A paper describes a structure:
The PP2Cα is the prototype PP2C family phosphatase for which the catalytic mechanisms and cellular functions have been well characterized. The active site of PP2C is located at a cleft between two central β sheets, and it harbors a binuclear metal ion site required for catalysis. In the crystal structure of PP2Cα, the M2 metal ion is directly coordinated to the primary chain carbonyl of the Gly61 and the side-chain carboxylate group of Asp60. In addition to these direct interactions, the M2 metal ion of PP2Cα also indirectly interacts with Glu37 and Asp38 through water-mediated hydrogen bonds.
To reverse the negative charge of the D38, we also made a D38K mutant to see the mutating effect. To further elucidate the structural basis of the impaired function and catalysis of D38 mutants, we solved the crystal structures of PP2Cα-D38A and D38K with Mn2+ at 2.0 Å and 1.85 Å, respectively, and compared these structures with the PP2Cα-WT that was crystallized under similar conditions (1.95 Å). In addition, the electron density for the side chains of D38, A38 and the partial side chain of K38 are also unambiguously assigned in the PP2Cα-WT, PP2Cα-D38A and D38K crystal structures, respectively. However, in contrast to the crystal structure of the PP2Cα-WT, the electron density for the M2 metal ion and the phosphate can't be clearly located in the D38A or D38K crystal structures. In the crystal structure of the D38K mutant, the bridging water between the M2 metal ion and the D38 in the PP2Cα-WT was pushed outward by 0.7 Å because of the longer K38 side chain. The relocated water (WAT145) forms a hydrogen bond with the side chain of K38, which disabled M2 metal ion binding. Therefore, the crystal structures of PP2Cα-D38 mutants revealed that the D38A or D38K mutants of PP2Cα abolished the M2 metal ion binding by altering the H-bond network of the PP2Cα active site. However, the overexpression of an equal amount of PP2Cα-D38A mutant as the wild type only slightly decreased the EGF-induced ERK phosphorylation, and the overexpression of the PP2Cα-D38K mutant has little effect on the ERK phosphorylation increase. Accordingly, the D38A decreased sulfate binding by 4-fold, and D38K decreased the sulfate binding by 10-fold. However, the basic limbs of the D38A and D38K catalyzed pNPP hydrolysis were flat, suggesting an inefficient general acid catalysis for these two mutations.
Numbering used by the authors: 2 to 321, 327 to 368
Write the structure that this text describes.
Amino acid sequence: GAFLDKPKMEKHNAQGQGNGLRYGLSSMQGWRVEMEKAHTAVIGLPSGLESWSFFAVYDGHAGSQVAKYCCEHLLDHITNNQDFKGSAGAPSVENVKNGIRTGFLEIDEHMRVMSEKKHGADRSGSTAVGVLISPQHTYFINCGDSRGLLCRNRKVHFFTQDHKPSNPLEKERIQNAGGSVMIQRVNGSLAVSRALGDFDYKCVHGKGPTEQLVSPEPEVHDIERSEEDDQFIILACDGIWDVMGNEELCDFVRSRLEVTDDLEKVCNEVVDTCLYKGSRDNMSVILICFPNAPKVSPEAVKKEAELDKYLECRVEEIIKVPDLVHVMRTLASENIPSLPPGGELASKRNVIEAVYNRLNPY
Ligand SMILES: [Mn+2]
């Protein structure tokens, strides 16, 4: 077990701006009995990196301890090691990448020793996906099956590759570590091949830290920034990506940015939409907008109001007492034009439900 009888829709939001960036984020427990997600969102880093920013989403499993420790200390483990520092004044691309790798391996070992010392009872682990944004580069960081993407010139310019046990190189490591991949799971249990924590899967004698059943090793990609063309970055857990593809979500987010510049609201729209598309997991998303992110469009705002009015009239008529499920089903059969790209009817469910509720409050 572990599903609630009804989803917990409460949103935890944050927003901020600086270094030319604006961001919003939303997390929601949804159908799950526990919330095991965390995030980091910081504009302006310590120790001479004030023009830097860092954003990350951590999808915890078997507990929130690992995800919570990461969201508070991963960044310092990355920036405060000899690999990141190097190196004259400004960190080279190699310093940044090596520094991030060392940061992951060191925080993992750090947690392992803390747990050993205090006889920790939890056996939790966590994915991490994030971006370290410098004045000239965006470094995407991925460890696990959370995912991030960069929208540039209205297209998906880059997205992180999910670490899954069945991936060829992952399966190879797992087998060489004495394990197997059964369907999509390590030993028929873990659905992730890389994560922080999961120390029971990191006890293989004769294998280094990155050769275990589960690896803490991140994949890092440096993308040179384009002031003219960079639009936004989306970071989210698999609770989002399970039900929306890269291009769908990019298109959907664009469509929402053309209607509002409230980034928390856009993130809330993504999360609700994914819930309505059937996601039964915790959900978290961070949206980071660059200076040339899409701007609110008067025509887009009008089209949205026209659509909302149209849906309201349809609901009025369909009622003429069908439940909401049946009203949604009727609306779907109508093949209504001009729904949000990617979001589709699910992304309009809040509008529909609001009207339905005014008409059938009991
Ligand atoms: Mn998840």
